[PDB]
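A quick word before the example. In earlier lectures we treated sequence and structure as two separate objects. From today on, think of them as two lines of the same record. Here is SusD homolog written that way.
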Amino acid sequence: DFWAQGNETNAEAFLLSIYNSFRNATMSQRPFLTYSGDMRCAPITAYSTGDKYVAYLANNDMGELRNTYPDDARGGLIMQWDVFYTAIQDANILLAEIDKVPGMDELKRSRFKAEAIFMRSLSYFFIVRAFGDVPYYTNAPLPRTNMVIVLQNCLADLQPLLDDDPGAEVLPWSYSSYSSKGIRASRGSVIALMMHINLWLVQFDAQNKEQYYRNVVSLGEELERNNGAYSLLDINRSSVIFAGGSDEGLFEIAQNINFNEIFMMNAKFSDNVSYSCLNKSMPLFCYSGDYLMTLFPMYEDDARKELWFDEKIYSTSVSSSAPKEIKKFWNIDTYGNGTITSNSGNQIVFRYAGALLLYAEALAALGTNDTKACELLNRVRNRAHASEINTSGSELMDAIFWERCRELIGEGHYYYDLVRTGKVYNRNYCMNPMTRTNFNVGAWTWPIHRNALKNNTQIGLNLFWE
Ligand SMILES: [Cl-]
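And the structure line, produced from the sequence above:
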């Protein structure tokens, strides 16, 4: 009925409910993205020890996180994949039913299908990164499917979106409407996701890593056919990047304060690392000054130092009396009854600087063109007014890893980059590492909440936490 007697407008509303569910899973009903991607194994300390989840995340004490916060948005909810599966199941429905909509525009029909496939793939990717093996279905009780299979099947679903649409008509490179720009899947969204999926396959299906890296290079070459749709904004216009809808964004989760589409405060990295614009005496947490002295060396130029951090960047104080904040994302606004957020912007899931660094990373790992890898890296270095890098081999691979840590701080990549590179168990790259043995038995995953077992009797838990 909804479909067979529907129309483009109702099909689009249904598609937008898929985006809504993904937003709920990541930002609006759970602080999933920032807990799982920024905070976990990060060298961070709470200003108030009563905020126990900060240390638990820092220390990978995920079992104590689940005992202290069993059901709520500081732990247990994040351990539930239910909201991502709402997105997945609605994508499955749209794909099964949309051909029934009488006489709608066929370009729009093809676009909505492409967007639904993208969002399904993005949801599966996000839950694989958090949970490991996950139940896999595309039919509108199943066991957990091998994460390598899930990732490979996602890649297979996404590839045709590029190959069948050589003109970027069904998914354009970018949208000119503010109602779509950054927040509806584009060709660039698809490319970035595929690069991430390949790089996860490098870690977890390593026997085929040469092919996955080659895939990322291929994807980079395609990204660079965007003909000026994407660009790196000036570093002094950083707030324009993080507001959302900029020419640097590749995929973003929409926030719209005026329309009551508001992320949880605790879900927004910015709101956890700011105080002066929020009428608070200190933020939720801060980064080690030693870490930031490593990350942003004091004797080398880098405009991110001045523009993204306050003057206490290197402070080793974790004192209430001497707080420090990160100002990278500031786009301050108020809503409801006087509630202030430091970041009214979209959450930037993938952006062009990140994708250029992934392209560089893959090239450097293949060892086939270190000069081009440097060129890519240096586009990001030059935008930050940091020194150009001219190196090769292991030094180049390290440079690109550390550059992603500098460039993407607070955007939900830190922990996940550590996992997919194996650096999460290496003290040379992570201040709060886990052990390699613990990694090998699944200590990089989140616990799976018992609610997942009610919903599906064929599900085994993540046993490191059991
Ligand atoms: Cl990225």
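Notice the following. The domain at 1-466 is CATH 1.25.40.390 (Serine Threonine Protein Phosphatase 5, Tetratricopeptide repeat). We will return to this example when we discuss secondary structure assignment.
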